[PDB]
DNA sequence: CGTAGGCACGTCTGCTCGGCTCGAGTGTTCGATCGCGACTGAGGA
């Protein structure tokens, strides 16, 4: 039931074997011959055309890679509930400054 | 890392292109580099060594911008540092400039970060002793692997 | 030697520019107007500054500089042209710095500007305090830069702290306005279990940790251990830290400075430390020769407390006398060359013992006279003139 | 300022490679007139003209990373550039599977570990279309 | 007609709060020997 020399020697020999296989393969000048849900994603899009129209586009994504990246943003944006917020902050700063100026007028 | 000398293919040359033109060398020696045995530890993301390297790299860049300044009170601009490090929040850049510099709003040197008169700007060997190039390579390996995993 | 001379009178100025040194009563423009003590200290400071240049730019690059100078000179030495090329055998400062910059790519112009062109040494006064809450070591290093021989150091400074987890080096940046340097400290888990404490080299030893503080892990601190500046350090450790630094350090200059600092602490633990140094072969012999005189001074300071015989007498009879006769010395065999030096230096320090009446005891004088009478040198292959001369001393 | 030099490898047909090699090792500026390189605004297509004879070229991506290393004493080597592209003369087509050396052949297919979960750009375009829209309806689907 | 006293941004200042890393410190588990009594063949009364 070795817990000491057996493990150490086994690791050492596997190390020498891999080192020696890599050296040989790499220095070879031999020529080498040239050789979960199963569910797709479909999106419906509603847009307005020039003049007056309301066409709807149904687009199906069968690439599971595109799927993963697409959904992950929605799930994030669904939990994410901004230029508008920055504008609101600017309005807040303006109001605060006006209030401070009113305070200065009251003091003087 | 173990390297293995191979002769070049008989068809391949090396073209060095610059803005002015193309230049051609032949090559005769090409090594194949095996699996590397790392001697430097790449830090992890958000590690203490990682944040220390980011802070020290920003400080070294700020010192070298102060050395390059020709004004007799050495002065730099903030948006040079914001062009170099655009992912940095400006609170961290102002933290690095808080000691060793001060902001002049009015008069001469206005909208510049002049160097403090009591502050001795470090010499070239001290700035070299701050950050090592191998630490920069370890940081670049960390952020490239961060991108690939992400 | 150089810090004593430069604090005594002005300073030695390597490479003056033509007066450049007006603090001293002769002119340094010519070698034949220099004082002889200034000439001796000039050569001494020159070789220490070259050791500093080796510290900044490594020893193999230094030997490459010297080989490049010699090779230019020996290609010059074979030409016949009357000095078109014979002046490559003459070195200058600018040529030496240019050859250094050629072989290394680093220039040493701050080090040259500080230790060559400026003529001063630095004085360091250090004191520490251990913050138990944040586990840090707050050093306090202040310089005396207003003395006549001194100058102000603004570079980096190495400090070596021996804690229970081992020996750690730290680099401190000592700018003009700097006073407190907070360095971090490690665990104290080698006091939880008895494990060996690892030293500056790869080895580890058993230490008696009964004298150490319970709250601090750090065993000793050394400011600038490698002598990388031209400095005089005055560090304020605790006496047990000086005793640990005397016993378990693997550096002879730290053992010597702990011997030098143990003269202010005449406690019996310091007597035990110096006596354990004296008994210990595999200590460097010039440390034991200093511990003799330190033990004599400590013994003179703790009269009306000293228990047994006079200092080093029982140790002399244990090391150098017969097993059957304690007062008869062994016949002289000087073939070891370290117990010869220790044997000829131990009565010289033992004679500095004094009683409560300020007179040398008649137990040490009788011991020295019996060392003189029973001296037999018909058996060693070496002469006895220095040992007998030290007996007269 | 300094701009990092951009080195790539040029692979020629073997007879044309022999003529270009002889003209390079000769060293006259006669080679300069003989060998020209025209890179098309596709970015992955070109002509290499050897002795005024046009050859069709493709700039391909190499599977490994090469690095040019210069030396003065043949004991210490300084890295000068990274090479990752080759202008072979005679997208998926612009990716080369083999490496330059003989042991590295079919490296991308066999000696490269592949970890998997263009696509990101397509997802960004889809998000932009959703933004320009009014109502979006989504369902993970089954076979249909 | 001119001419000095009030509104928007930009960048920095400073304080507060929450989160993340990291190592010291402390308690918990598990193989590694140490010792005791016993098992079991073995050469002389």
Swiss-Prot record, chain B:
Intracellular or extracellular location(s): Nucleus
Disulfide bonding pattern of the chain: none
Highest taxon above the source species: Eukaryota
Modification comment: Phosphorylated by casein kinase II in vitro.
Description of how the protein assembles with itself and partners: Component of the TFIID basal transcription factor complex, composed of TATA-box-binding protein TBP, and a number of TBP-associated factors (TAFs), including TAF1, TAF2, TAF3, TAF4, TAF5, TAF6, TAF7, TAF8, TAF9, TAF10, TAF11, TAF12 and TAF13. Interacts with TAF7; the interaction is direct. TAF1, when part of the TFIID complex, interacts with C-terminus of TP53. (Microbial infection) Interacts with SV40 Large T antigen.
Described purpose of this protein according to its UniProt entry: The TFIID basal transcription factor complex plays a major role in the initiation of RNA polymerase II (Pol II)-dependent transcription. TFIID recognizes and binds promoters with or without a TATA box via its subunit TBP, a TATA-box-binding protein, and promotes assembly of the pre-initiation complex (PIC). The TFIID complex consists of TBP and TBP-associated factors (TAFs), including TAF1, TAF2, TAF3, TAF4, TAF5, TAF6, TAF7, TAF8, TAF9, TAF10, TAF11, TAF12 and TAF13. TAF1 is the largest component and core scaffold of the TFIID complex, involved in nucleating complex assembly.
Family indicated by similarity: Belongs to the TAF1 family.
Disease as annotated in the protein's UniProt record: Dystonia 3, torsion, X-linked: An X-linked dystonia-parkinsonism disorder. Dystonia is defined by the presence of sustained involuntary muscle contractions, often leading to abnormal postures. DYT3 is characterized by severe progressive torsion dystonia followed by parkinsonism. It has a well-defined pathology of extensive neuronal loss and mosaic gliosis in the striatum (caudate nucleus and putamen) which appears to resemble that in Huntington disease.
Protein name (database record): Transcription initiation factor TFIID subunit 1
Organism of origin: Homo sapiens
Taxonomic lineage: Eukaryota, Metazoa, Chordata, Craniata, Vertebrata
UniProtKB/Swiss-Prot annotation, chain C:
Subcellular location field: Nucleus
Record-annotated membrane-spanning stretches: none
Coiled coil: none
Effect caused by changing residue 16 to H: In NEDFCF; uncertain significance
Tissue specificity of this protein: Expressed in all tissues tested.
Similarity remark: Belongs to the TAF2 family.
Noted disease: Neurodevelopmental disorder with feeding difficulties, thin corpus callosum, and foot deformity: An autosomal recessive disorder characterized by impaired intellectual development, microcephaly, delayed psychomotor development, pyramidal signs, thin corpus callosum, and foot deformity.
Other observations noted: PubMed:9418870 was unable to show an association between TAF2 and TFIID.
Function: The TFIID basal transcription factor complex plays a major role in the initiation of RNA polymerase II (Pol II)-dependent transcription. TFIID recognizes and binds promoters with or without a TATA box via its subunit TBP, a TATA-box-binding protein, and promotes assembly of the pre-initiation complex (PIC). The TFIID complex consists of TBP and TBP-associated factors (TAFs), including TAF1, TAF2, TAF3, TAF4, TAF5, TAF6, TAF7, TAF8, TAF9, TAF10, TAF11, TAF12 and TAF13. TAF2 forms a promoter DNA binding subcomplex of TFIID, together with TAF7 and TAF1.
Protein name according to UniProt: Transcription initiation factor TFIID subunit 2
Taxonomic source organism: Homo sapiens
Residues of the full protein shown: 401 to 800 of 1199
UniProtKB/Swiss-Prot annotation, chain D:
Assembly and interaction partners: Component of the TFIID basal transcription factor complex, composed of TATA-box-binding protein TBP, and a number of TBP-associated factors (TAFs), including TAF1, TAF2, TAF3, TAF4, TAF5, TAF6, TAF7, TAF8, TAF9, TAF10, TAF11, TAF12 and TAF13. Part of a TFIID-containing RNA polymerase II pre-initiation complex that is composed of TBP and at least GTF2A1, GTF2A2, GTF2E1, GTF2E2, GTF2F1, GTF2H2, GTF2H3, GTF2H4, GTF2H5, GTF2B, TCEA1, ERCC2, ERCC3, TAF1, TAF2, TAF3, TAF4, TAF5, TAF6, TAF7, TAF8, TAF9, TAF10, TAF11, TAF12 and TAF13. Interacts with TAF1; the interaction is direct.
Residues found modified as Phosphoserine: 128
Additional observations: Overexpression of TAF7 in HeLa cells inhibits cyclin D1 and cyclin A gene transcription and causes the cells to accumulate in early S phase. In contrast, depletion of TAF7 from TFIID complexes by siRNAs increases histone H3 acetylation at both cyclin promoters and stimulates cyclins CCND1 and CCNA gene transcription.
Whole sequence portion shown: 9 to 187 of 349
Role noted for this protein: The TFIID basal transcription factor complex plays a major role in the initiation of RNA polymerase II (Pol II)-dependent transcription. TFIID recognizes and binds promoters with or without a TATA box via its subunit TBP, a TATA-box-binding protein, and promotes assembly of the pre-initiation complex (PIC). The TFIID complex consists of TBP and TBP-associated factors (TAFs), including TAF1, TAF2, TAF3, TAF4, TAF5, TAF6, TAF7, TAF8, TAF9, TAF10, TAF11, TAF12 and TAF13. TAF7 forms a promoter DNA binding subcomplex of TFIID, together with TAF1 and TAF2.
Name recorded for this polypeptide: Transcription initiation factor TFIID subunit 7
Cellular compartments annotated: Nucleus
PTM statement from Swiss-Prot or TrEMBL: Phosphorylated by CIITA. Ubiquitinated by TRIM26; leading to proteasomal degradation.
Tissues expressing this chain: Ubiquitous.
Organism whose genome encodes this protein: Homo sapiens
Domain of life per record: Eukaryota
């Amino acid at each position: 039931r070795f817990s000491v020399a057996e493990h150490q020697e086994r690791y050492k020999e596997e190390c020498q074997r891999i080192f020696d296989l890599q050296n040989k393969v790499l220095s070879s000048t031999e020529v080498l011959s040239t050789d979960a849900t199963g569910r797709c994603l479909k999106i419906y899009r509603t847009f307005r055309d020039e003049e007056g129209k309301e066409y709807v586009r149904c687009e199906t994504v069968r690439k599971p890679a595109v799927i993963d990246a697409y959904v992950r943003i929605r799930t994030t944006k669904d939990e994410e509930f901004h230029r508008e917020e920055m504008r609101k902050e600017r309005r807040r700063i303006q109001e605060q400054l006006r209030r401070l100026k009113r305070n200065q007028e009251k003091e003087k | 890392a173990p390297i293995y000398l191979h002769k070049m293919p008989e068809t391949d040359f090396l073209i060095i292109r610059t803005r002015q033109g193309y230049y051609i060398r032949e090559l005769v020696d090409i090594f194949v580099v095996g699996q590397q045995c790392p001697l430097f530890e790449v830090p992890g993301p958000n590690s203490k060594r990682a944040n220390t390297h980011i802070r020290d790299f920003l400080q070294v860049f700020i010192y070298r911008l102060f050395w390059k300044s020709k004004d007799r009170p050495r002065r730099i601009r903030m948006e040079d540092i914001k062009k170099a490090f655009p992912s940095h929040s400006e609170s961290s850049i102002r933290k690095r400039l808080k000691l060793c510099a001060d902001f002049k709003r009015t008069g001469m040197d206005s909208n510049w970060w002049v160097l403090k008169s009591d502050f001795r700007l470090p010499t070239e060997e001290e700035i070299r002793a701050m950050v090592s190039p191998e630490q920069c390579c370890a940081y670049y390996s960390m952020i490239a692997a961060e991108q690939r995993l992400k | 030697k150089i810090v004593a001379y430069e604090l005594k009178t002005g300073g030695v100025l390597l490479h003056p520019i033509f007066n450049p040194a007006s603090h001293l009563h002769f002119s340094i423009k010519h070698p034949h107007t220099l004082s002889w003590e200034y000439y001796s200290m000039f050569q001494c400071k020159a070789h220490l500054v070259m050791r500093l240049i080796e510290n900044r730019i490594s020893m193999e690059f230094m030997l490459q500089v010297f080989n490049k100078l010699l090779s230019l000179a020996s290609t010059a030495s074979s030409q016949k042209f009357q000095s078109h090329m014979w002046s490559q055998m003459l070195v200058s400062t600018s040529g030496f710095l240019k050859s250094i910059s050629n072989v290394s790519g680093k220039d040493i112009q701050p080090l040259i500007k500080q230790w060559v062109d400026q003529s001063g040494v630095v004085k360091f006064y250090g004191s520490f305090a251990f913050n138990r809450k944040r586990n840090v070591l707050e050093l306090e290093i202040k310089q005396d830069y207003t003395s006549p021989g001194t100058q102000k150091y603004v570079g980096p400074l190495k400090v070596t702290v021996q804690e229970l987890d081992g020996s750690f080096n730290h680099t401190l940046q000592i700018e003009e306005n700097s006073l407190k340097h907070d360095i971090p400290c490690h665990s104290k888990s080698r006091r939880n279990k008895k494990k060996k404490i690892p030293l500056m080299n790869g080895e580890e030893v058993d230490m008696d940790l009964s004298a150490m503080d319970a709250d601090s892990p750090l065993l000793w601190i050394r400011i600038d251990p490698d002598m990388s500046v031209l400095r005089k350090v005055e560090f304020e450790q605790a006496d047990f830290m000086w005793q640990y630094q005397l016993r378990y350090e693997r550096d002879v200059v730290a053992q010597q400075e702990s011997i030098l600092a143990l003269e202010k602490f005449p406690t019996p633990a310091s007597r035990l430390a110096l006596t354990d140094i004296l008994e210990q072969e595999q200590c460097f012999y010039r440390v034991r020769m200093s511990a003799c005189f330190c033990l004599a001074k400590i013994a003179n300071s703790m009269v009306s407390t000293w228990t047994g015989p006079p200092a080093m007498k029982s140790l002399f009879t244990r090391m150098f006398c017969c097993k059957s006769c304690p007062n008869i010395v062994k016949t002289n065999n000087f073939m070891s060359f370290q117990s010869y030096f220790l044997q000829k230096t131990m009565p010289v320090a033992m004679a500095l013992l004094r009683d409560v009446h300020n007179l040398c005891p008649k137990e040490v004088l009788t011991f020295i006279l019996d060392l003189i009478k029973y001296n037999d040198n018909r058996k060693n292959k070496f002469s006895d003139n220095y040992y007998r001369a030290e007996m007269i001393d | 300022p300094h701009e990092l030099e951009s080195q790539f490898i040029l692979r020629l047909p073997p007879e044309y490679a022999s003529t270009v090699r002889r003209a390079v090792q000769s060293g006259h500026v006669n080679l300069k007139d003989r060998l020209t390189i025209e890179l098309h605004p596709d970015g992955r297509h070109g002509i290499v003209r050897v002795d005024r004879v046009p050859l069709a070229s493709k700039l391909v991506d190499l599977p490994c990373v090469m690095e040019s290393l210069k030396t003065i004493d043949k004991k210490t080597f300084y890295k000068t550039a990274d090479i990752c592209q080759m202008l072979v003369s005679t997208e998926k087509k612009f990716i080369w599977n083999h490496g330059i050396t003989l042991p590295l052949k079919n490296v991308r297919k066999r000696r490269f570990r592949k970890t998997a979960k263009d696509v990101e750009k397509e997802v960004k375009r889809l998000l932009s279309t959703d933004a320009e829209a009014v109502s979006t309806r989504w369902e993970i689907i089954a076979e249909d």
